[PDB]
Amino acid sequence: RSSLEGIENFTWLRFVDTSLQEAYRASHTDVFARAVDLASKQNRLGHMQIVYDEPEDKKWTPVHALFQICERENPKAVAEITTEGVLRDLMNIARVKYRELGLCRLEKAARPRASAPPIEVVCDSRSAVIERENIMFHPAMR
Amino acid sequence: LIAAHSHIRGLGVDADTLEPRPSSQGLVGQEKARKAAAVVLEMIKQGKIAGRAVLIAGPPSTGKTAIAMGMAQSLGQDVPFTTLAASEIFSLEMSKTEALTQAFRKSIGVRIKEESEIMEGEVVEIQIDRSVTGGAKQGKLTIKTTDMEAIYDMGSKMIDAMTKERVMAGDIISIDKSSGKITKLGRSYARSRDYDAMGVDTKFLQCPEGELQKRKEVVHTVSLHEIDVINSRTQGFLALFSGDTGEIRSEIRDQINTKVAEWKEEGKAEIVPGVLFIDEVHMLDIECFSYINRALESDLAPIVIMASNRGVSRIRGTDYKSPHGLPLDFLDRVVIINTHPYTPDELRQILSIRAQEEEVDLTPDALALLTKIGQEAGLRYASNLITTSQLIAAKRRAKQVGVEDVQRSFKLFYDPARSVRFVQESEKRLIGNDGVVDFSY
Amino acid sequence: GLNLIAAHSHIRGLGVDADTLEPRPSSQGLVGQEKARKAAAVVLEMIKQGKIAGRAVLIAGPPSTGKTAIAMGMAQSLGQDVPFTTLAASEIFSLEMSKTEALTQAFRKSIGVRIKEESEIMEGEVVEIQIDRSKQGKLTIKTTDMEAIYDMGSKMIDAMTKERVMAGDIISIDKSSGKITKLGRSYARSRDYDAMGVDTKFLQCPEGELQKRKEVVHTVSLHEIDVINSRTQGFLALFSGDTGEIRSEIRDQINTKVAEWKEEGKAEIVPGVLFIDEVHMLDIECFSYINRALESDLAPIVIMASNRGVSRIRGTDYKSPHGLPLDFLDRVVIINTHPYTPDELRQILSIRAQEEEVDLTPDALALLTKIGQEAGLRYASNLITTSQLIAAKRRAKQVGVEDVQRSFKLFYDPARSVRFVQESEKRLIGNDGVVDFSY
Amino acid sequence: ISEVRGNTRDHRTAAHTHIKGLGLNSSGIAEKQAAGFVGQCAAREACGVVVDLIKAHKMAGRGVLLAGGPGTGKTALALAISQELGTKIPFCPITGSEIYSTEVKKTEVLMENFRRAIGLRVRETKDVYEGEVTEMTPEEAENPLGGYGKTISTLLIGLKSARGQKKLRLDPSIYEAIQKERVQVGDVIYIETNTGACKRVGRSDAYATEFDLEAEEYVPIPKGEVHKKKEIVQDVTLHDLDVANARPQGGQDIISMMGQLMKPKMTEITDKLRMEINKVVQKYINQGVAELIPGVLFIDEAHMLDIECFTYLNKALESPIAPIVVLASNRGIATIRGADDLKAAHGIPPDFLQRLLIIPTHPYEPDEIRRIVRIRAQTEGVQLTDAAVDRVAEHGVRISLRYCLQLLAPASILARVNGRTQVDVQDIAEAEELFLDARRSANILTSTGESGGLHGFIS
Amino acid sequence: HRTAAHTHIKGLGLNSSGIAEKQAAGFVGQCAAREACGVVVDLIKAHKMAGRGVLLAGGPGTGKTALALAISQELGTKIPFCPITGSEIYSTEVKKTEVLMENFRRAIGLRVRETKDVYEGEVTEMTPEEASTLLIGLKSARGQKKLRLDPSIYEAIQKERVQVGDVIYIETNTGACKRVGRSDAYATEFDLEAEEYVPIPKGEVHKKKEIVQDVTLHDLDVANARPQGGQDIISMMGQLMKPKMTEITDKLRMEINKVVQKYINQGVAELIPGVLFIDEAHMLDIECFTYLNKALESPIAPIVVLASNRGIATIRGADDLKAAHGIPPDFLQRLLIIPTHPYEPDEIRRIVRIRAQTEGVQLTDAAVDRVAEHGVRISLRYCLQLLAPASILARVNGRTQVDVQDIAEAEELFLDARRSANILTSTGESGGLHGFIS
Numbered sequence A: 001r002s003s004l005e006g007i008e009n010f011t012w013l014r015f016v017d018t019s020l021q022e023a024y025r026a027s028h029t030d031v032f033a034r035a036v037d038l039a040s041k042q043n044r045l046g047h048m049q050i051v052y053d054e055p056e057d058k059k060w061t062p063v064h065a066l067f068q069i070c071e072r073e074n075p076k077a078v079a080e081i082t083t084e085g086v087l088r089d090l091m092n093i094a095r096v097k098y099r100e101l102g103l104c105r106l107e108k109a110a111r112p113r114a115s116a117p118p119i120e121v122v123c124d125s126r127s128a129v130i131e132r133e134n135i136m137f138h139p140a141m142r
Numbered sequence B: 001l002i003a004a005h006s007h008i009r010g011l012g013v014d015a016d017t018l019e020p021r022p023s024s025q026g027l028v029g030q031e032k033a034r035k036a037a038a039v040v041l042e043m044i045k046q047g048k049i050a051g052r053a054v055l056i057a058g059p060p061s062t063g064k065t066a067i068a069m070g071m072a073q074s075l076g077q078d079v080p081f082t083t084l085a086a087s088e089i090f091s092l093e094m095s096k097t098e099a100l101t102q103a104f105r106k107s108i109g110v111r112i113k114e115e116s117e118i119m120e121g122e123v124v125e126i127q128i129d130r131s132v133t134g135g136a137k138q139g140k141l142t143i144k145t146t147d148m149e150a151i152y153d154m155g156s157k158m159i160d161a162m163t164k165e166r167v168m169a170g171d172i173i174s175i176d177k178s179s180g181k182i183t184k185l186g187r188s189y190a191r192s193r194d195y196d197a198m199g200v201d202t203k204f205l206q207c208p209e210g211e212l213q214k215r216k217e218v219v220h221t222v223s224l225h226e227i228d229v230i231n232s233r234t235q236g237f238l239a240l241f242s243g244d245t246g247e248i249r250s251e252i253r254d255q256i257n258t259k260v261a262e263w264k265e266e267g268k269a270e271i272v273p274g275v276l277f278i279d280e281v282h283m284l285d286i287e288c289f290s291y292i293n294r295a296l297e298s299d300l301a302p303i304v305i306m307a308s309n310r311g312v313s314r315i316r317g318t319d320y321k322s323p324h325g326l327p328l329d330f331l332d333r334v335v336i337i338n339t340h341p342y343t344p345d346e347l348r349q350i351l352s353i354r355a356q357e358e359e360v361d362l363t364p365d366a367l368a369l370l371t372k373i374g375q376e377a378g379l380r381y382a383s384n385l386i387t388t389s390q391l392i393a394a395k396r397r398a399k400q401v402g403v404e405d406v407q408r409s410f411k412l413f414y415d416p417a418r419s420v421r422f423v424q425e426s427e428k429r430l431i432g433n434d435g436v437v438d439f440s441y
Numbered sequence C: 001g002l003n004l005i006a007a008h009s010h011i012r013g014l015g016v017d018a019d020t021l022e023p024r025p026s027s028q029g030l031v032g033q034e035k036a037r038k039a040a041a042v043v044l045e046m047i048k049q050g051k052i053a054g055r056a057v058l059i060a061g062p063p064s065t066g067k068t069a070i071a072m073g074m075a076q077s078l079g080q081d082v083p084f085t086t087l088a089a090s091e092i093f094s095l096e097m098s099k100t101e102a103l104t105q106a107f108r109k110s111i112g113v114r115i116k117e118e119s120e121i122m123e124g125e126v127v128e129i130q131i132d133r134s135k136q137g138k139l140t141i142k143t144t145d146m147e148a149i150y151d152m153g154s155k156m157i158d159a160m161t162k163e164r165v166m167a168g169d170i171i172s173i174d175k176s177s178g179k180i181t182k183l184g185r186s187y188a189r190s191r192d193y194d195a196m197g198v199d200t201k202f203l204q205c206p207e208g209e210l211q212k213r214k215e216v217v218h219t220v221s222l223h224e225i226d227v228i229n230s231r232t233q234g235f236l237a238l239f240s241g242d243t244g245e246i247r248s249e250i251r252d253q254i255n256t257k258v259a260e261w262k263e264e265g266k267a268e269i270v271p272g273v274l275f276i277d278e279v280h281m282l283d284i285e286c287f288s289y290i291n292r293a294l295e296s297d298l299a300p301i302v303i304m305a306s307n308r309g310v311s312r313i314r315g316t317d318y319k320s321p322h323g324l325p326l327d328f329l330d331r332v333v334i335i336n337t338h339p340y341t342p343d344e345l346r347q348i349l350s351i352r353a354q355e356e357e358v359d360l361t362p363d364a365l366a367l368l369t370k371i372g373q374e375a376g377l378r379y380a381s382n383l384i385t386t387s388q389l390i391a392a393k394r395r396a397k398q399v400g401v402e403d404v405q406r407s408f409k410l411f412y413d414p415a416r417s418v419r420f421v422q423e424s425e426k427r428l429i430g431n432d433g434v435v436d437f438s439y
Numbered sequence D: 001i002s003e004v005r006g007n008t009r010d011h012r013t014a015a016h017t018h019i020k021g022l023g024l025n026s027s028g029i030a031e032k033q034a035a036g037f038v039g040q041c042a043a044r045e046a047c048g049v050v051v052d053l054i055k056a057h058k059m060a061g062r063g064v065l066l067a068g069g070p071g072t073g074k075t076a077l078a079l080a081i082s083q084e085l086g087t088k089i090p091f092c093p094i095t096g097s098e099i100y101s102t103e104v105k106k107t108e109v110l111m112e113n114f115r116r117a118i119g120l121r122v123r124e125t126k127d128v129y130e131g132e133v134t135e136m137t138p139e140e141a142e143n144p145l146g147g148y149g150k151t152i153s154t155l156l157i158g159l160k161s162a163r164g165q166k167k168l169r170l171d172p173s174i175y176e177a178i179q180k181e182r183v184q185v186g187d188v189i190y191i192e193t194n195t196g197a198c199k200r201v202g203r204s205d206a207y208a209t210e211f212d213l214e215a216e217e218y219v220p221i222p223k224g225e226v227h228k229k230k231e232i233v234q235d236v237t238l239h240d241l242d243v244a245n246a247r248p249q250g251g252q253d254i255i256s257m258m259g260q261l262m263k264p265k266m267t268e269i270t271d272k273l274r275m276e277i278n279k280v281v282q283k284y285i286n287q288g289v290a291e292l293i294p295g296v297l298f299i300d301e302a303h304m305l306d307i308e309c310f311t312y313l314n315k316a317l318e319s320p321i322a323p324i325v326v327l328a329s330n331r332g333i334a335t336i337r338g339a340d341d342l343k344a345a346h347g348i349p350p351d352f353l354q355r356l357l358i359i360p361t362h363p364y365e366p367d368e369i370r371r372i373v374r375i376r377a378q379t380e381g382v383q384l385t386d387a388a389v390d391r392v393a394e395h396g397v398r399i400s401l402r403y404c405l406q407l408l409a410p411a412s413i414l415a416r417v418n419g420r421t422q423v424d425v426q427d428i429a430e431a432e433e434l435f436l437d438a439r440r441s442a443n444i445l446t447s448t449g450e451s452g453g454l455h456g457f458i459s
Numbered sequence E: 001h002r003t004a005a006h007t008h009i010k011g012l013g014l015n016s017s018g019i020a021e022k023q024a025a026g027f028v029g030q031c032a033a034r035e036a037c038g039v040v041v042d043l044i045k046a047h048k049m050a051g052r053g054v055l056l057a058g059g060p061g062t063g064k065t066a067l068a069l070a071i072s073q074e075l076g077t078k079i080p081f082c083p084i085t086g087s088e089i090y091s092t093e094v095k096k097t098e099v100l101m102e103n104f105r106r107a108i109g110l111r112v113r114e115t116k117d118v119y120e121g122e123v124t125e126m127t128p129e130e131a132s133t134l135l136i137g138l139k140s141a142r143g144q145k146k147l148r149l150d151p152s153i154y155e156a157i158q159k160e161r162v163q164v165g166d167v168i169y170i171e172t173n174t175g176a177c178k179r180v181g182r183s184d185a186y187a188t189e190f191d192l193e194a195e196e197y198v199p200i201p202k203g204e205v206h207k208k209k210e211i212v213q214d215v216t217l218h219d220l221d222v223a224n225a226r227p228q229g230g231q232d233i234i235s236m237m238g239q240l241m242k243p244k245m246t247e248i249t250d251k252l253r254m255e256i257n258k259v260v261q262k263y264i265n266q267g268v269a270e271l272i273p274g275v276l277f278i279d280e281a282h283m284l285d286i287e288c289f290t291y292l293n294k295a296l297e298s299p300i301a302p303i304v305v306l307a308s309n310r311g312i313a314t315i316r317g318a319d320d321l322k323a324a325h326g327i328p329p330d331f332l333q334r335l336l337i338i339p340t341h342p343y344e345p346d347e348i349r350r351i352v353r354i355r356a357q358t359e360g361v362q363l364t365d366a367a368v369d370r371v372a373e374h375g376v377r378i379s380l381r382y383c384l385q386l387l388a389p390a391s392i393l394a395r396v397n398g399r400t401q402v403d404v405q406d407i408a409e410a411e412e413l414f415l416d417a418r419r420s421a422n423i424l425t426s427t428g429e430s431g432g433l434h435g436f437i438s
Ligand SMILES: Nc1ncnc2c1ncn2[C@@H]1O[C@H](COP(=O)(O)OP(=O)(O)O)[C@@H](O)[C@H]1O
Pocket: B004, B005, B006, B008, B026, B027, B028, B029, B030, B059, B060, B061, B062, B063, B064, B065, B066, B067, B350, B353, B379, B380
């Protein structure tokens, strides 16, 4: 909050859609925890691309999302709404033909000859046993 | 579009005698080389013999790539023909050896057959049950022919497909029961009127006849490389396409080689060995050649065809020269085809094919002048002037390319030799190898 | 403070008449270099006027001739208002990205996008949250100067719940986004608990009106907008680095939209400066890229400095002046900085002594000026700090000549050092590794 | 929110802002000076045929070389070609130096730009219903299902836009979208007819005053018709299809979502993917639903490409789908950047040079330099006395064209700070003394750096 | 304790006036170079000046590294001394200019005086107060105490599996807490349980102690660049996820300087600029010196001390340029240069005696003579390496002290490189079966 104006290093945070709380969270949570947070969010800037089309709409964008240019303008959103799925199919070529080749159903031709569980610390203490369960069987990730 | 070799539609040989015709299927001349390539092409088709390295050699132009492109057209789509530029091998994601291993294994097909089973019928009714707050879904499809009705239970994956396809009663659908894909074929009912946003009033179809289930034999061809990628991984099979695949471990390949042999013995698969064409093969390192030479020796090696423009030339990654720029103990394993520069009537015939492929109506004197240019500037330059003179002729609305258009094109665009003289005539004003230059008048 | 005294701390501006651009013999810390300062002032005029895109100016001269000092003075005189990217050429040899990406980024850093915004932010200490279900609720906030009750919507009560807002917390609500932030707790609650968690901090209560409508000006680099669009939370890469060779089609979109903002008047484009120091450490592939980079509407003015004579260009084996390609030098205008006269040295050494708060005696400053003539500006400059410390060791009031003499005795200049290296060559590792360790 | 600046708009001037086209007659003959060009009548006429080559869709994989010394307008000619094509045709400029990525092999970097230069134009119809939700109302069914007690046969939704409102009768299955999406009266939504689902943009800003605090931003009522049926034309490059297939963007799993939180590292896109993309593209072209629109890959300082780049370009140019490649070079006879034993003209391997249409660019006469000075002055807005013009042109003959174009702005500063609304000889004679050329500077080096020394240049 | 090479160097041995004593603090000679290093110590301790460069220049074995480690001990433990070699910067993770930046900031310290309130006791009560606050009761052998816990420190106590009867450690101000174990008053709650039983804490349940914490500006960089420690558990996957170095932006380092100065203005933190010492600076290349040239102009930069033993030598990365010290003349102008000279025979004798008594070796006078002779005729480093072997040989002869016999044996078991080169010249005369490989 002391660096949020002018030439100060967080000047841009008004126009990136994150709040100060979201910035502080994303700087402290790891990539997995941040990815779980992403699962909750709605790609509302992609829906705006469908609605705020016209010259009267001025390609409207909420000013606090001004710098999310590539989210507000992206063919991916439009190709999913057009009824002739032409560009929609052109964007799924790889996943379709992989499946059409039957590679998803063909028997496995190889597998690892040996398999093992992770190596573990062995320590004669109860805190070690708790910390093993907290990390190697991590409940929130699980 | 029209590309450099788009007129090449085969090798132009009598299939019975392997005799090259002097002009057919778009190839001209090179009769000795075309017969040699036809013998290679036959032993490709026969499949019996593995690991033959054939080097096509010659000066620049003279059709070495054109011959290799004629071979590819004559094999058709079924036999693998992996084109590789030797500069593709210097990956940052994998070693040159791994990049070569993948290029070989891309050139061996596994042709796998399965009996799919398909359904096709009118949807009479759909029921879907959905758990509030997500999770489980359940449903039933009632589907009809002129001759059957049956009610099929549906799982989540099929209900996802049904709703993505927006299946409705009165649709004619087919279901590939083995892959699970659905296609709407049309509708037997009208589109209703009670609702809005129903979308497209798709094609009318009469109801399918016969039984709902039909078996369907289908055949798929996959490379040994494509089997490698999905068997070195649990997840991320897009590496078939994105190229994210790392250096695959040899244990996986050794297993796959064993199992693909067993699939052949079981009659599950046919192995269809094809061609790896390494163009510009002189661009490989000594380390690459000392890999190919022993990679060739395996039973699953493809037939490797190469082209080189090089004379007695330095081998990359070492201090010394060799013929073709290729190591002698590599060339020991190679049978060499030599292409020869064309005569004026061969030039004339090629330029006529280029003109016809580009649909350009040359006047006879323009073809004569283009032939004279072809003898002295080269076939590629004389080819470039055809499409250029067509455009210039269109500026003057000429119905045919006249001599004036070829002369106008010859004026505007320099050949290589004339450009070399232009460089020599302006050595003061071009940047030298010393980096010195004079900018003043 | 945390800014210590540095080599260019005395440089406070460019030192020219703002009307005529005529320099004066010293001001703002600079001494002499009048033509180079006048030329630098002419460049600073076209930087500030901004319409001339992509000029390149080379500051060329011997060591210790004020090339960096003039670049600092130009940056000071340009002020904070305009971007001034300062790049050592060594920084472009990144392992995480290609050299042309690293040059592209530095170019993008030097164009500002300026936006002015007003937005409603409500900040205060939470007094109570009240909730009813039958969803609705009420929020009481105080400043030092107000207390008010606000009706909260259902989504707002959820956000309060998700973020564990208690009484005594300081919260901010950006009404434009609707998002809550918790700044901390009021320091009045310092006695509310015996033990506090690691993520808790106390604050003074917000002051004045609860909801404020400040007008704020924002200037962001084009590089910042790139890195923000690089990936879903790309703004984090602005600090850790942690960014790829950004796709050109992203920059293509951003340039097109920034033009729309300038057409619509949402933003003002503020072209600034890139200063590439030691530009002779670039290679033939950098220079050939920079040619195209300069030739664009969104190119800054590029200043660069070199001290190289006729010297081999890097990434090749032929020599050229300044160590730069002539193909590149054709796109450049050159400012030449000269050596200094003893009277200009005498002034600079006085300016340094003042910035270092060292009281030279007149004889010490005279002797120190002789050393500057005989042994170079930087060496005599470095003796100022040394003589101050030696004087302090004898508790002297002023730096005398004896303190400069002892400084000169203890620390060799480069020429006297090179002589020592020549005199003892067998005791030192030669270029062929030979040495004798014996007496 | 943002405080819009009312002040007048203007354009920055760069080294090529004066160039506006090739300046040719309808006969294709170059006008002696036009569209910002002076001279180069041969090279402009050649580029005009190249322009008509590109606009004719027979071309695939042709090569052009712009050959000539530094300053001779090869960059200007490439930009003029680009302007003659205009924005509807891709022009993809790079230097050879940009191909040396750290992140993929350089043949991938070049094939990306090769496919960036190829455009695809896809026409589709967008078909939606769109508005603020004015009502939601269940239509109880005539024949309810036993054991449920509730059975709805239609859900009715009112949508309003700025331009109207409609009573919309929807299949009850939309309950799933509404309940997941949490649509409410006063929310702005669209219904897409290819699914019958709905998506929520936000709450209508007509309701922005419902509470003193609510935790969402509001969005304006859609300013279009309540029902949109529009053809939409999408600009696509084939490189966009490469990336969109090789790294799918929307995946909702943890590895996808972790992937999109980390830098989008380039990958060595397979030829198998590119060749299948081509086949599906050619299918849709034959359906007539898409146009292929090949454009221009322009590589400046192409002598910075090495022999591995050139040997790959042989294969690349032979592709049946390929842009035109235009190369510019100034390197005399020079060593090939990656084949130290081989020298060739233009620094281009003789193998590859035979493929290119070479276009030479020549030096400029003293009177052409003067005409360029006139064009450049009025473009930067500078105005000169004729004696200032002649002095600038004289330095252009003796030193370099570029150096003299670069004196205009400095002298304009010195004129205005001397109170003069036009630049005169006194200002040129002053700009030329503050701002040296490379030769006069090199003379200072050669005189001063004759030895080591305390004030010597370093070498 | 162990005896490394420099362990006899206790300091610079300067007079009150800053003149060097001819033998003091375990130095002999180098008086002019010790006095010059004394002024560098004053420069550092004044903490007025950024980014002054110093060069130590002189032959190998002339004490350049003794002098740098004497400075490090004149500065004491408070001031950060960051030693590297010029070869350490060729990291594979990040550009070498980033590695220099990280080492400049390791040389700048930041001191915080933190009062730690520790409560360690058996958990006698855990009473959730709200439905947020917890009350916890803790007991030692010497009384019990109640504490009001913020919901944050409560959930930390609750994320650890603390229960009544457990023994715990709490830091009141930091919010750190640890389960020390289960109190052994419950040791017979079962006859076997997978549990660790510990005695009740026998001191005060409350302790207050003041710890002068030191960090560095690089520590603040690393903490702010990425989630660290328990914030990033997925780091356990390695590969993409491990805590790689990244090329920190100067946006971050500038914004860190802002925050750090805020806490200096509050008086919470004390800034302590120190020293970056680079040995074998001739292993730096032209691009590194090009960066150092700029980086020394920043207002924070530490004092940099360089050592080189090269004569006129090619600079790395530009074989076209030969310079003294292997340092580019461009950059050499920026440095205060201290020459170190070779030692006299009498000085070698004194250094031998100093190190003998530092290894605990004791010598006859003739044993000192013979070792010192090898110091003069071969190398100071060689003769000092004789001392420890000769002590072993004397010990296994039962002798209390090393004598000529034990050195004359050591010098024949352990050759110098000079006699070894003579063996190579006599024996590697040809590529025969018993020849050395060429
Ligand atoms: N015998 C031929 N018949 C038809 N076209 C040919 C023949 N030889 C060469 N060409 C054409 O001339 C051009 C150059 O031939 P190419 O095969 O590419 O030479 P290179 O062997 O050097 O690759 C191509 O466009 C090719 O189609």
